[PDB]
Amino acid sequence: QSRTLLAGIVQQQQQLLDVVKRQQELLRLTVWGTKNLQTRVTAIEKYLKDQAQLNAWGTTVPWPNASLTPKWNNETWQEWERKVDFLEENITALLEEAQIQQEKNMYELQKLNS
Amino acid sequence: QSRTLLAGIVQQQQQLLDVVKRQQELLRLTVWGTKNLQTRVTAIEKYLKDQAQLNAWGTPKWNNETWQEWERKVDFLEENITALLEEAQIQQEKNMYELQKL
Amino acid sequence: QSRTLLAGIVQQQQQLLDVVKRQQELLRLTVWGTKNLQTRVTAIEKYLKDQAQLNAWGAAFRQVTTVPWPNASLTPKWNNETWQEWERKVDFLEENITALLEEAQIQQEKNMYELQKLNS
Ligand SMILES: [Cl-]
Ligand SMILES: [Cl-]
Ligand SMILES: [Cl-]
Numbered sequence A: 001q002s003r004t005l006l007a008g009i010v011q012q013q014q015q016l017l018d019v020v021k022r023q024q025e026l027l028r029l030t031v032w033g034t035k036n037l038q039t040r041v042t043a044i045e046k047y048l049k050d051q052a053q054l055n056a057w058g059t060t061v062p063w064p065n066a067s068l069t070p071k072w073n074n075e076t077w078q079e080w081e082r083k084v085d086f087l088e089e090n091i092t093a094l095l096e097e098a099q100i101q102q103e104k105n106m107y108e109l110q111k112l113n114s
Numbered sequence B: 001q002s003r004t005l006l007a008g009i010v011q012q013q014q015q016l017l018d019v020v021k022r023q024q025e026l027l028r029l030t031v032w033g034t035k036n037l038q039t040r041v042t043a044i045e046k047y048l049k050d051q052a053q054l055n056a057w058g059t060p061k062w063n064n065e066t067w068q069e070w071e072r073k074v075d076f077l078e079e080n081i082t083a084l085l086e087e088a089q090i091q092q093e094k095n096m097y098e099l100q101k102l
Numbered sequence C: 001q002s003r004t005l006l007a008g009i010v011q012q013q014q015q016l017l018d019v020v021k022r023q024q025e026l027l028r029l030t031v032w033g034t035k036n037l038q039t040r041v042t043a044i045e046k047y048l049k050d051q052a053q054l055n056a057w058g059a060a061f062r063q064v065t066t067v068p069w070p071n072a073s074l075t076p077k078w079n080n081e082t083w084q085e086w087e088r089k090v091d092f093l094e095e096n097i098t099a100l101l102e103e104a105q106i107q108q109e110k111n112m113y114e115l116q117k118l119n120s
């Protein structure tokens, strides 16, 4: 009498798991893009600071940022990398455990009538 | 009877809730990084325009407003999802008690 | 009499679906931002390379002071192809997740239907 609902609940759990797995894939691609851009923006900032210094040796608009800025940005994003890489590893683990629990639940649903 | 499957369903809901909490922390970090890059690219664009004008002597609006909108939206959603997650956790605790009664 | 629990579980599935739908909206906005930045950084890279080459040329010939743009010749094409692929993948995922969310919504309604009948 409740079997139908139970089956649909277990089914919905698979559906939600599928959604969050595919959301994790899209999040990973977004994280990749962010990393790729960070390296390219840092290169541009480095380039422009080098060109400003060369000009200075020679007017030419002083590269405004502070001396310390490259170090700071490097340290901040290294922290960012460590946090994001940990979260990606943890979510992968949690997703794997959810898949196992999904299988356990299906097994139990199948054992249900007999 | 169906108790064991039920236990397993309740547990998988906590597992799903845990994934989405972690995914929100990852998404917040990614949003931070987007913001940080947006500010740095804006700075670079401004610098290059300044330099161009100086050189020639011898866009920003639009972008700012569009990113203002983006910020409002992002910010709304971050708040909203945090509250939804906390509600989910509370309902999770209720479902665990009810299973308990079982 | 597992009813209250079952209603609690169906309600929590609703809450989880609501969370993942809002998380997708946040993800879509983040993707948008990533794309906007990619377009602008690519524009900057192109401008700087062009400027560097034009200045190198004029200093050689002066025909109506710059640090050479260091990247390899082929980098912009490689960048473009890599992000075209990124885009293709992001687009697949956005279509797929939207489809999975609609399926989830359908199954939530079927579950609610069944919950309303078993207790009645
Ligand atoms: Cl700098
Ligand atoms: Cl987009
Ligand atoms: Cl290049």
Ligand SMILES: [Hg+2]
Pocket (backbone or CB within 6 Å): A082, A083
């Ligand atoms: Hg940490």
Ligand SMILES: [Hg+2]
Pocket (backbone or CB within 6 Å): B014, B093, B096
């Ligand atoms: Hg718990």
